Design a protein around this ligand. Sequence first.
Ligand SMILES: Cc1cc2nc3c(=O)[nH]c(=O)nc-3n(C[C@H](O)[C@H](O)[C@H](O)COP(=O)(O)OP(=O)(O)OC[C@H]3O[C@@H](n4cnc5c(N)ncnc54)[C@H](O)[C@@H]3O)c2cc1C
Ligand SMILES: Cc1cc2nc3c(=O)[nH]c(=O)nc-3n(C[C@H](O)[C@H](O)[C@H](O)COP(=O)(O)OP(=O)(O)OC[C@H]3O[C@@H](n4cnc5c(N)ncnc54)[C@H](O)[C@@H]3O)c2cc1C
Ligand SMILES: Cc1cc2nc3c(=O)[nH]c(=O)nc-3n(C[C@H](O)[C@H](O)[C@H](O)COP(=O)(O)O)c2cc1C
Ligand SMILES: Cc1cc2nc3c(=O)[nH]c(=O)nc-3n(C[C@H](O)[C@H](O)[C@H](O)COP(=O)(O)O)c2cc1C
Ligand SMILES: Cc1cc2nc3c(=O)[nH]c(=O)nc-3n(C[C@H](O)[C@H](O)[C@H](O)COP(=O)(O)O)c2cc1C
Ligand SMILES: Cc1cc2nc3c(=O)[nH]c(=O)nc-3n(C[C@H](O)[C@H](O)[C@H](O)COP(=O)(O)O)c2cc1C
Lengths: 383, 381
Amino acid sequence: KSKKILIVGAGFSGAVIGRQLAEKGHQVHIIDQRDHIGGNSYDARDSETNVMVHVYGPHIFHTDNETVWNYINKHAEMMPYVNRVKATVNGQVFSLPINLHTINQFFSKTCSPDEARALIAEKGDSTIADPQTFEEQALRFIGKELYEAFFKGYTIKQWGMQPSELPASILKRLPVRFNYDDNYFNHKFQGMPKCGYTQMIKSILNHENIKVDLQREFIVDERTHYDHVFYSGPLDAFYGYQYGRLGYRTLDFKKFIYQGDYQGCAVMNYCSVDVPYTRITEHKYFSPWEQHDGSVCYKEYSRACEENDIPYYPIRQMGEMALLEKYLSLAENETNITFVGRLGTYRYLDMDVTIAEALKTAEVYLNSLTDNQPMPVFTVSVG
Amino acid sequence: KSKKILIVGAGFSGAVIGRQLAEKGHQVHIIDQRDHIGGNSYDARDSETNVMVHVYGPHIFHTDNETVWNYINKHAEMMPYVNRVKATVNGQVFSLPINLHTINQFFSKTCSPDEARALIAEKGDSTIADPQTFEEQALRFIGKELYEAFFKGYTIKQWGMQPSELPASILKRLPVRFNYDDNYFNHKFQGMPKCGYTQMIKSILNHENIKVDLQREFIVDERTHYDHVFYSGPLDAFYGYQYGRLGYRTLDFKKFIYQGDYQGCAVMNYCSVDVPYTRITEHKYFSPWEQHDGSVCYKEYSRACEENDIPYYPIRQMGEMALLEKYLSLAENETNITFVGRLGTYRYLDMDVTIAEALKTAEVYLNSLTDNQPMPVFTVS
Ligand SMILES: Cc1cc2nc3c(=O)[nH]c(=O)nc-3n(C[C@H](O)[C@H](O)[C@H](O)COP(=O)(O)OP(=O)(O)OC[C@H]3O[C@@H](n4cnc5c(N)ncnc54)[C@H](O)[C@@H]3O)c2cc1C
Ligand SMILES: Cc1cc2nc3c(=O)[nH]c(=O)nc-3n(C[C@H](O)[C@H](O)[C@H](O)COP(=O)(O)OP(=O)(O)OC[C@H]3O[C@@H](n4cnc5c(N)ncnc54)[C@H](O)[C@@H]3O)c2cc1C
Ligand SMILES: Cc1cc2nc3c(=O)[nH]c(=O)nc-3n(C[C@H](O)[C@H](O)[C@H](O)COP(=O)(O)O)c2cc1C
Ligand SMILES: Cc1cc2nc3c(=O)[nH]c(=O)nc-3n(C[C@H](O)[C@H](O)[C@H](O)COP(=O)(O)O)c2cc1C
Ligand SMILES: Cc1cc2nc3c(=O)[nH]c(=O)nc-3n(C[C@H](O)[C@H](O)[C@H](O)COP(=O)(O)O)c2cc1C
Ligand SMILES: Cc1cc2nc3c(=O)[nH]c(=O)nc-3n(C[C@H](O)[C@H](O)[C@H](O)COP(=O)(O)O)c2cc1C
């Protein structure tokens, strides 16, 4: 039997869940409160320059998950693109993430890989048994100089907290590289959709069993008209923020246009705390197969997400997780709804991860129909 | 009607011409004086370390020709790979080709693309009206500091001549990229074959109608036993060097083994004339999908190609070109032979260009049979 399915959000989570269910006979209704599909992966062209802008931040696809990679290759033409980030600090321009070139330039050396290991082991404090803070992780592995140049001010700008108050886990993600590889991501598959993500999501959304209504906020009354609801909007919002708002950072993107090449690369970080934006992005460099004389650029600023700002990065410290636990115990009591995605589960999720989880969620739901088991509220852990 | 083809050389020129024709019926005899196939593209695994070594120096595949790309993808699995070269001079490590990073690092600046254009325009030596040498052209374009750090020394080593001895026309464009792009090659397709060029050519060569004999020299007396000869060996040698030897640079490779990552990139250039090698190459870096604890490296030394050396880079200056012209006008009176390849034609040819010209050559020969026309001696200009 064909089921009636409400899906709240037309970003990757809604779109991929909808597509998998559509293809199996169910009637899928996808709503989104914005006037366009795509969620935070949405891109659109700038009128004047015709530059394709990644509206809610640069979005670089990267994955080791070949199943996911083949899936999106069914919906776009993936162009090779290797993200290579630069940084300006101390009157110089460096390569990130920290590599043998960054090391040799910063200390004015011509170390080989093994000489650079010895120079960095010497700067690091191997007396720290198990770093508990971001700061201690930097002192342990990269040393004071590298830390204060590349990480301290930059991290303070992103998080609005001292690094001695942030977990080690943030920097554990980012080892020093003792060769000349300056690819930002190590994933086996990396690229950018030739006609953009909006178009990719449009192809995912393109089926006979899917109706998509925009400018349409979810209404708690609707649930009864459907067999199941998939919700990728904010968890706290669905509960009227009755216990408080989940803490996020937000970003302000300050637009400017330049005639020519403003910086010569897609991403420039500004490591100094005394430079108020975290970075400048030059969006035409995200589509190097195209040529554009005019250029759309953004200065990006980080700050605490207030009531009417878009939530970007979830903060997820003790207070935030105590608040989450309260919404979760409301959530565990529900029937015929599943909360999914970055907003629905209060997790930062890359595009490929979001896709893989959306495929699994559809599969769980389909399996639950044929086994006549109830569909759980979450198909992922958040304890 | 089935032709007896002799093809001199089992590198890309002969392999590709040979397969195109073997597939339309002709009997193809390929010979090569060396003891392995592949010509200068040949690779092989080093015994101690198992690193795939590029025996005649690094070979990176790159093209904008998608027909050529699809063609090698039939005979190999192409892995992605983007060449990015580092260079050590004056106690610093830089990015090449010269780019906005090289410039900011070199001068200690944080220039944007356009401020950097303004910076190089001032450094450019503007008192030099009408430059005649490579030296003067470089000086006018980018000034003394950049010229002497990155060009003067490396030119001396690479060409065995001072840039004052070479023509201004050798570099027609200001050589700075005013962006952060440090991909050495700008081609749409770039990659490395997962199992090596030798296996790729071994696959091009695998046909019933193709016999390959190695350790086998061409001998003029052979010509009479075949209907056509495709010749990829050196044009001057084919005619006994009767007018002189075409000028080339040759390269010496000095092998060492390091346990670890010796330098942390495939290719490190040394710009200084006081360092006698041109580059150090670390070959495992040409196969990043592979992991190796032991690493095979080479210091590369460039010198004049003398009579017993392998010819690498064609010098192609005034005298060499006049000299080439003489063998060309002898070749123009040959019949039943076509000269092809970097050696048969005295050109530096990429792998992709060489494959495209081979496919076209076989086709021109196929067409000439069906149309009853004579095959030309050269299939390019
Ligand atoms: C700054 C930033 C940079 C990023 N960069 C990368 C990157 O480089 N690479 C990468 O792989 N990933 C990146 N990501 C992750 C990426 O954006 C997510 O993977 C993806 O957006 C998740 O999609 P989703 O559909 O689950 O959620 P979303 O895209 O957020 O979409 C959810 C949808 O729900 C709608 N909605 C919410 N509430 C309601 C409501 N009550 N009623 C109706 N509609 C509602 C919203 O309007 C929205 O359109 C980045 C994320 C951020 C914040
Ligand atoms: C230092 C160097 C670096 C290079 N790097 C790149 C690179 O990164 N990427 C790229 O695309 N290309 C590169 N190339 C170009 C590449 O090597 C050529 O494209 C390729 O070798 C062309 O193959 P071919 O068959 O025409 O000629 P060759 O490979 O030179 O083959 C000619 C064959 O003919 C044989 N032969 C000659 N005379 C006789 C005779 N008397 N009797 C019998 N056999 C004979 C030879 O033994 C040889 O095996 C490089 C070239 C050089 C010199
Ligand atoms: C509060 C916060 C939480 C973040 N959580 C993640 C995360 O879980 N995974 C991730 O890849 N990036 C996360 N990021 C961002 C990265 O650490 C990264 O450095 C940042 O997005 C800017 O640089 P990037 O886009 O190159 O990664 C977070 C950023 C902030 C401010
Ligand atoms: C340091 C350096 C020196 C080079 N010297 C030469 C040279 O002497 N002759 C030459 O033809 N190319 C030389 N090149 C290669 C040139 O950059 C050239 O632009 C390009 O590689 C030409 O080939 P393409 O057909 O792939 O574009 C040199 C490159 C570098 C970085
Ligand atoms: C004939 C020739 C000689 C060159 N010699 C040098 C050199 O000595 N040092 C150097 O850094 N670059 C040298 N170059 C490299 C120029 O930067 C090269 O054209 C540059 O890579 C062009 O880059 P592009 O790919 O942006 O066109 C040479 C290039 C050519 C064609
Ligand atoms: C005399 C001479 C001619 C060369 N001609 C070419 C050429 O036509 N195309 C090319 O890509 N490289 C050519 N090169 C090699 C280039 O200089 C460049 O360095 C190549 O990208 C790396 O070769 P190399 O660094 O050993 O010189 C030539 C080198 C020399 C010495």
